[PDB]
Amino acid sequence: ASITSVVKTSELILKSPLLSKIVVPLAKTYVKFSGYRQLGFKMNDLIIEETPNMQLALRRLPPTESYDRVYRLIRATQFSLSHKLATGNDITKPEEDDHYLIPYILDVEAEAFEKDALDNLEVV
Amino acid sequence: ATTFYNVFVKRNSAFVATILASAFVFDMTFETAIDNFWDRINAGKQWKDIRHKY
Amino acid sequence: MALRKKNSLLNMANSYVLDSPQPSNLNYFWNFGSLLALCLVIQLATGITLAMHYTSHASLAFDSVEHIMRDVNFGWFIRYAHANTASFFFICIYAHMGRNIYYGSYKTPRVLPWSIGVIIFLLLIITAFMGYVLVFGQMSLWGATVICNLVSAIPWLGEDIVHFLWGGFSVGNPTLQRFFALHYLMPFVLAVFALLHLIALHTAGSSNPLGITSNVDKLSMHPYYSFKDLITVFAFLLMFTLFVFFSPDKLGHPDNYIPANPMVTPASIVPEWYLLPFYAILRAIPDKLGGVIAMVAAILILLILPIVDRSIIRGNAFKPISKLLFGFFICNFLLLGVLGQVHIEPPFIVLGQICTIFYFSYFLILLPMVSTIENIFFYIGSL
Amino acid sequence: YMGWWGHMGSPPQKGIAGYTISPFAARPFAGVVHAAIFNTFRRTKNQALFVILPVSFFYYVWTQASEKNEWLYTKAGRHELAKAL
Amino acid sequence: PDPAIALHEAAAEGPCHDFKHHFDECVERVTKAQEAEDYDHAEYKEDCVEEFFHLQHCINDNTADKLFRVL
Amino acid sequence: GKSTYKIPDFTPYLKKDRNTDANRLFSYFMIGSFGMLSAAGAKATVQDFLSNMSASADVLAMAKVEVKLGAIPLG
Amino acid sequence: MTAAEHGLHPAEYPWPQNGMLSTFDHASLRRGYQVYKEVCAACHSLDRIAWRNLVGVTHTTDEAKAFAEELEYDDEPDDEGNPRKRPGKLADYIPGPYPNEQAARAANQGALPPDLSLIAKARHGGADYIFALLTGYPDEPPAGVVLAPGMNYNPYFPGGGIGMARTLFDGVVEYEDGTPATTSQMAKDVAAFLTWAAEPEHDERKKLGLKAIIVISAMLGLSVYIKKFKWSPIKNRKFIYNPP
Ligand code: HEC
Ligand code: HEM
Ligand code: HEM
Numbered sequence A: 001a002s003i004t005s006v007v008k009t010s011e012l013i014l015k016s017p018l019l020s021k022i023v024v025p026l027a028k029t030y031v032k033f034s035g036y037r038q039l040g041f042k043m044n045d046l047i048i049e050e051t052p053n054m055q056l057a058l059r060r061l062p063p064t065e066s067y068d069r070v071y072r073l074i075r076a077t078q079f080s081l082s083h084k085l086a087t088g089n090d091i092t093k094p095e096e097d098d099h100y101l102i103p104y105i106l107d108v109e110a111e112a113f114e115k116d117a118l119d120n121l122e123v124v
Numbered sequence B: 001a002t003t004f005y006n007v008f009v010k011r012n013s014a015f016v017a018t019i020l021a022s023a024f025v026f027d028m029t030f031e032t033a034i035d036n037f038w039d040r041i042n043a044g045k046q047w048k049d050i051r052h053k054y
Numbered sequence C: 001m002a003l004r005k006k007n008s009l010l011n012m013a014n015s016y017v018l019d020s021p022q023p024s025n026l027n028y029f030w031n032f033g034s035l036l037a038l039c040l041v042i043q044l045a046t047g048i049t050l051a052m053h054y055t056s057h058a059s060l061a062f063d064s065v066e067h068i069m070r071d072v073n074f075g076w077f078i079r080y081a082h083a084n085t086a087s088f089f090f091i092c093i094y095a096h097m098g099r100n101i102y103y104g105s106y107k108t109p110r111v112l113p114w115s116i117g118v119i120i121f122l123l124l125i126i127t128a129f130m131g132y133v134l135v136f137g138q139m140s141l142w143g144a145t146v147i148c149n150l151v152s153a154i155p156w157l158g159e160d161i162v163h164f165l166w167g168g169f170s171v172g173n174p175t176l177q178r179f180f181a182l183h184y185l186m187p188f189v190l191a192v193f194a195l196l197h198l199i200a201l202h203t204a205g206s207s208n209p210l211g212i213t214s215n216v217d218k219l220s221m222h223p224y225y226s227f228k229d230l231i232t233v234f235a236f237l238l239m240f241t242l243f244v245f246f247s248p249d250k251l252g253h254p255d256n257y258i259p260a261n262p263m264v265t266p267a268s269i270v271p272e273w274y275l276l277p278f279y280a281i282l283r284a285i286p287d288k289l290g291g292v293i294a295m296v297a298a299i300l301i302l303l304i305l306p307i308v309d310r311s312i313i314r315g316n317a318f319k320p321i322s323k324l325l326f327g328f329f330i331c332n333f334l335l336l337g338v339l340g341q342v343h344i345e346p347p348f349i350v351l352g353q354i355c356t357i358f359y360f361s362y363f364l365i366l367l368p369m370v371s372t373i374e375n376i377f378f379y380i381g382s383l
Numbered sequence D: 001y002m003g004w005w006g007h008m009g010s011p012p013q014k015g016i017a018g019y020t021i022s023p024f025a026a027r028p029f030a031g032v033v034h035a036a037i038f039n040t041f042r043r044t045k046n047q048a049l050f051v052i053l054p055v056s057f058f059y060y061v062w063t064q065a066s067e068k069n070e071w072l073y074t075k076a077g078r079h080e081l082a083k084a085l
Numbered sequence E: 001p002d003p004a005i006a007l008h009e010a011a012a013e014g015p016c017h018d019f020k021h022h023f024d025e026c027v028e029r030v031t032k033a034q035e036a037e038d039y040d041h042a043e044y045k046e047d048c049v050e051e052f053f054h055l056q057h058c059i060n061d062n063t064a065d066k067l068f069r070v071l
Numbered sequence F: 001g002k003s004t005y006k007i008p009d010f011t012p013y014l015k016k017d018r019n020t021d022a023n024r025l026f027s028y029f030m031i032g033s034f035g036m037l038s039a040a041g042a043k044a045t046v047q048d049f050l051s052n053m054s055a056s057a058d059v060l061a062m063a064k065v066e067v068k069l070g071a072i073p074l075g
Numbered sequence G: 001m002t003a004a005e006h007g008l009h010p011a012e013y014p015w016p017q018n019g020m021l022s023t024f025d026h027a028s029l030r031r032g033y034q035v036y037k038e039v040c041a042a043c044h045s046l047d048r049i050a051w052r053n054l055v056g057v058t059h060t061t062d063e064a065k066a067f068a069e070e071l072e073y074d075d076e077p078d079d080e081g082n083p084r085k086r087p088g089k090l091a092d093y094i095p096g097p098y099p100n101e102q103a104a105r106a107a108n109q110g111a112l113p114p115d116l117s118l119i120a121k122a123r124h125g126g127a128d129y130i131f132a133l134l135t136g137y138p139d140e141p142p143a144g145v146v147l148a149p150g151m152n153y154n155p156y157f158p159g160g161g162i163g164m165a166r167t168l169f170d171g172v173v174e175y176e177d178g179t180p181a182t183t184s185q186m187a188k189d190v191a192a193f194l195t196w197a198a199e200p201e202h203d204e205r206k207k208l209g210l211k212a213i214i215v216i217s218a219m220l221g222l223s224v225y226i227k228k229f230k231w232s233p234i235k236n237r238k239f240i241y242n243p244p
């Protein structure tokens, strides 16, 4: 699935009052049980990157964001191999779990999908 | 410890020669030890234990 | 430049076993690949040695196996090693495949090693099935008869194909001699495909339990994974020793110590344990052709995991619902195994059908639904 | 998606200092008893439900099926067996 | 004499008495039912195999170790 | 946290006698023992395994031909 | 399936050979050979066993040669190509009671007594099944069982009706070591002997297994030390990050 898809569906849910009332609390619990914050990751660090679109989005990260992501990946890898969890400031707090990558990938995919559409235009 | 290191460990040629010589000794002594232990736990049961009757 | 890099032959070995850059955080489930290589080496060494003493003619086959047990020096060990390592081969391959499914090893960019892996698994099944016939005991013969008769379901030409496979009108000497020649060959084909799936993997490298890139943090294969592999090699050899020396027939069927008799039918004709889940799936469909298709589909459906997994994240480490579903899928696969060897009686007939539906609905319904919903929960939950 | 040493395909790394000590300088089994007890307990506790729930469910299903099958093939289960076939 | 004869008798009268009773009752019923006419043209003929199995399984559990101890 | 000249704490793992010959010799004793058992295990494995190719029991039984002599007449 | 169709499951008896470190009792093996020879061999062959196999297990070279030399075996034809017989040798196999299956079935009311060389491996239960079967013929079949003609009731045999009658009775054999030959004792000895016949490598195999267990366990322990030793620089690695 494309990030575009995921974001659009999420926005449909967040619009509907009923839907958001039942989905938002579930989603927050899911994230708590997922436990990626206990390895000091932000959610976007987990997105599959071995794709042309994602490699292009990662190249467009500002250098600071890019250097910080590299450190979180190395740090999480060291927790993984040691079978330890983050403690203290290494744990990602909910307020730090920012969608730093989502805007870049949405722009990459926007162009990719427009190109697909326009490759199939029919002069009327 | 320095002496032991210098003679048997420092040169890999010497280390491998010591390992192989030890393996030779281990192999011969372990064989004899297991043979005796096996004969004691299975005493009176083996052919060697009843052979004298025949 | 170091010789291991400069010389093209040495450099190929170097690239796979020494300088190969690995993730620094592979867990013990990444050790099944080297265990499978060990099983393949043991099966080649024991199998070629058994071939030096075995006679493929139906009049002598079963007795040549008794001669191996009784007269050939260490023949009992070589025979038991070969028969038990066939079971260990399947334990390791189910573990390796389970690792791959849990950690998302089938996702891009590793679709090619996974797809070749599915063919490896099919070749292992064929190899093991033909080898089991070679004993020419009761289970050998009757298992060959019932499994080869599934081909009769192929429309129009099915019966003709069966007679062609058998080289006659029933399982007999021609079938045994051809199964010997093919059983000897198939492991070499299997080794080539095993090599192919590794060369295909080498373009992305190994995945890792977190599902993220390891391009940020690599370790040489040697010495780290060489020495970590030795631990599981010695653990495997301990299990091997307990079966081969202390319980060599625990995994087998006593009927295979009765010589094949085309007249007497054994009480229950079942495949070896590692084929049992596929046999339960076949029983579930009442139609003969239906059942054969379902049974083949149960293996080929692994090829669609790259499509039906809609997750934006690789692997299950951080997906609580996917982990629950995976747990149910694995236990269902074990229950199918158990149902493969019960009698066709109530209430196991219906239970086998429900388990079969669950097996397929994992691929077709549940994994696509769950992976879609988890995508949304990760996005909304972290806003 | 993977290069080789010196050009592995990492985004540029900067600002991380990494430190470690020789295998001869370290105690390999440092903290082993704490790990073996407390670390294993934590790791096992956090994964226990994912194993217990499916295993217990499928064991119960099997147990019920096998006990019914056994009962149907006794004298007492004659009538219920006749209907079941 | 065969040590098993006495061990089996003792186990039947002792720890396996409930099973012994059920087997006995069963045999009584079946023999009586065979005595009655038009038994040969009956749909269901009861045996006592099940009860026999329950008794023998019980005797064996209480005897196996004892018997091999005196051989 | 900021200075890279302040080495992180390794005191939980550091051995005091890390530079001694005794310290190295111990780890080479473990490596050596491992190499020794692997050599003895390989030798056992190879010898027992390859012996399958030596004359089997039935072949050794068909050797040592016994011939009577009572049947054979003079000349 | 009904329990009767399966057969009653034999008890687990404490055989001397049960036990990771335990051999057969060879005195029991010798006595079991004598039960085979005097009772079973009337109907059952032991075709996979040669006289040489007994030597140094149950009998000395001389005893086994004497058993072989009492029998006649087919020799190579004489010089006119006429058949000849010779006395047996240690390489010869123990000869069976019948020339073919048809003769065997004719002597046993249609039933074919199996060869006993692999019977301990060819039946679920092994020695326990053989012991249970030989000692498990009730005086009377459970009320209601209708046996086919020439069948005997035995609950251990699947279906209950076996074509082999009870054969072991107190004192059918007189053991040469003075052991009281009770039904139970003879069944125990012959079951032990048949287990040896099915798996004659048993004693050596379990001793080699003990050596392997010890070596492999030590190697496993050392491999853990070595893995931890080599991995400690990776496990112990620490980072200081100063964001650029
Ligand atoms: C005179 C006949 C006779 C003698 C004596 C005899 N048997 Fe048998 N035995 C048979 C026949 C016939 C069968 C086949 C029964 C059947 O398949 O219904 C048989 C079957 C068996 C079976 C296999 C039952 C099965 O599961 O298929 C074993 C084991 C056996 N005998 C062992 C012995 C031993 C041990 C002895 C004596 C110490 C013995 N027999 C003596 C005639 C004999
Ligand atoms: C992946 C590799 C292999 C697997 C999974 C495998 C599997 C099997 C199995 C299940 C049997 C039946 C064993 C028994 O119960 O007695 C068998 C028998 C046999 N295999 Fe293999 N085998 C493999 C490789 C080989 C190879 C390379 C040869 C080379 C000829 C070979 C030769 C034999 C022989 C001669 C037998 C019959 C003798 C016997 O039963 O032990 N095998 N194999
Ligand atoms: C003879 C059988 C096999 C051998 C010897 C073998 C060997 C290996 C080895 C050594 C690796 C790299 C190390 C590891 O991850 O364990 C590996 C990786 C892999 N194998 Fe296999 N394999 C075999 C069968 C299979 C099968 C049946 C499949 C799939 C159905 C498969 C799919 C893969 C995949 C996807 C990977 C990459 C996993 C990753 O690192 O993320 N293999 N295999």
Ligand SMILES: CCCCCCCCCCCCO[C@@H]1O[C@H](CO)[C@@H](O[C@H]2O[C@H](CO)[C@@H](O)[C@H](O)[C@H]2O)[C@H](O)[C@H]1O
Binding pocket: C005, C011, C012, C013, C014, C015, C016, C017, C019, C198, C199, C202, C203, D003, D004
């Ligand atoms: C695992 C069994 C051990 C035997 C190894 C398998 C034998 C067959 C492997 C050869 C197939 C060719 O495999 C290919 O080789 C070259 C060099 O060897 C590797 O090339 C890699 O290493 C070399 C240096 O080590 C670099 O120049 C290169 O940038 C890098 O990609 C490829 O990544 C690998 O895919």
Ligand SMILES: CCCCCCCCCCCCO[C@@H]1O[C@H](CO)[C@@H](O[C@H]2O[C@H](CO)[C@@H](O)[C@H](O)[C@H]2O)[C@H](O)[C@H]1O
Binding pocket: F046, F047, F048, F049, F050, F051, G204, G208
């Ligand atoms: C890479 C190969 C290099 C060339 C090496 C050539 C090795 C080939 C030699 C085969 C030697 C077999 O030599 C013979 O082995 C067997 C074990 O197998 C030993 O036999 C000994 O142990 C075995 C079990 O291990 C017992 O069954 C036996 O009663 C006992 O005598 C003999 O005492 C020995 O003489």
